[PDB]
Design a binder for this molecule. Structure first.
Ligand SMILES: [K+]
Length: 317
């Protein structure tokens, strides 16, 4: 446990640890949500309403009029700041515990407004130091169990950034890790949060495909075999039947859930598997309320619930 490196003892934080905020970047009539603006905003409103029952929510947007649609919801705060990308998981600040204090890390993302967004937020609202790390990393490309283990895809971090051994060593040093599981197989920016996620310190929930005809079948079967070698308990998340927008197959995945205080918010796609994954996850998480939120509209811009938010954890800063 008590390991120090270059002045610091570091502990990585699993998503189920207690939080202060869930943070989101609203879609506005300027980015690529224009055609179905009211559509996605209605999804957001539902998502926000659900979360706000359990913990505070912070919504980031350029104009006060953007916030107007969410003014009635309890436990919702607002922060004026320009942006376009709504996928805050990609660029948002990532918390670690450093020498007993929570400390947010700002990795370099490839950009412009988003890169600034974090500085404004931390300078103006939180009034807190924002440690810049010179390393290419999106929040959706990593997943922690909170016991020094991290899950990631070989296709992500090796592409973005220079040995794997060096990247492995660097990542272990940054997050105080004892182990990184590098997944070669499976798919649905490549991101581990579309494929596999820790749901407790001993358990990994992961996408699977039951239809042999489907192109996902063998990649996900191979990913399954890899995950069987880790020794962690496995919980399966069968992908729904193909969904489409304008003849394009949407990357619907149940792995893009998000932990918040006392709850796990799971994407629903109006498929029979919604019910299967909710019951399965619910039984495996006896102290969480599992709540499905219609995530179909989100998929039009190639992301789901987890991609659209970032967690800010509770504790001494
Ligand atoms: K960043």
């Amino acid at each position: 446990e008590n390991l120090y490196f270059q002045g610091h003892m570091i502990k990585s934080i699993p998503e189920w640890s207690e939080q202060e905020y869930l943070m989101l970047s609203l879609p506005h009539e300027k980015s690529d949500w224009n055609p179905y603006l009211e559509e996605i905003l209605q999804s957001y409103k539902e998502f926000v309403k659900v979360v706000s029952e359990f913990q505070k929510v912070l919504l980031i947007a350029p104009k006060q009029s953007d916030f107007e649609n969410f003014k009635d919801i309890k436990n919702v705060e607002f922060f004026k700041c320009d942006t376009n990308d709504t996928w805050i998981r990609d660029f948002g600040a990532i918390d670690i515990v450093e020498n007993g204090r929570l400390k947010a890390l700002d990795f370099t993302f490839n950009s412009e407004l988003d890169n600034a967004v974090n500085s404004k937020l931390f300078k103006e609202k939180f009034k807190e130091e924002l440690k810049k790390v010179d390393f290419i990393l999106e929040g959706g490309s990593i997943d922690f169990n909170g016991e020094g283990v991290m899950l990631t895809s070989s296709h992500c971090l090796l592409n973005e950034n220079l040995n794997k051994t060096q990247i492995d060593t660097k990542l272990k040093e940054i997050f105080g890790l004892k182990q990184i599981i590098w997944l070669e197989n499976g798919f649905i920016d490549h991101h581990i949060d579309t494929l596999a996620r820790f749901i407790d310190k001993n358990t990994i929930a992961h996408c699977i495909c039951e239809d042999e005809e489907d192109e996902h079948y063998l990649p996900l079967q191979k990913m399954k075999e890899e995950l069987k070698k880790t020794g962690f308990d496995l919980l399966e998340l069968p992908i729904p039947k193909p969904l489409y927008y304008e003849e394009r197959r949407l990357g619907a995945t149940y792995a893009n859930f998000v932990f918040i205080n006392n709850a796990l918010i799971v994407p629903f796609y109006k498929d029979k598997n919604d019910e299967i994954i909710a019951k399965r996850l619910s039984k495996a998480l006896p102290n969480h309320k599992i709540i499905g939120v219609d995530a179909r509209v989100f998929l039009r811009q190639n992301g789901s619930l987890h991609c659209s938010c970032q967690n800010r954890f509770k504790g001494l800063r």
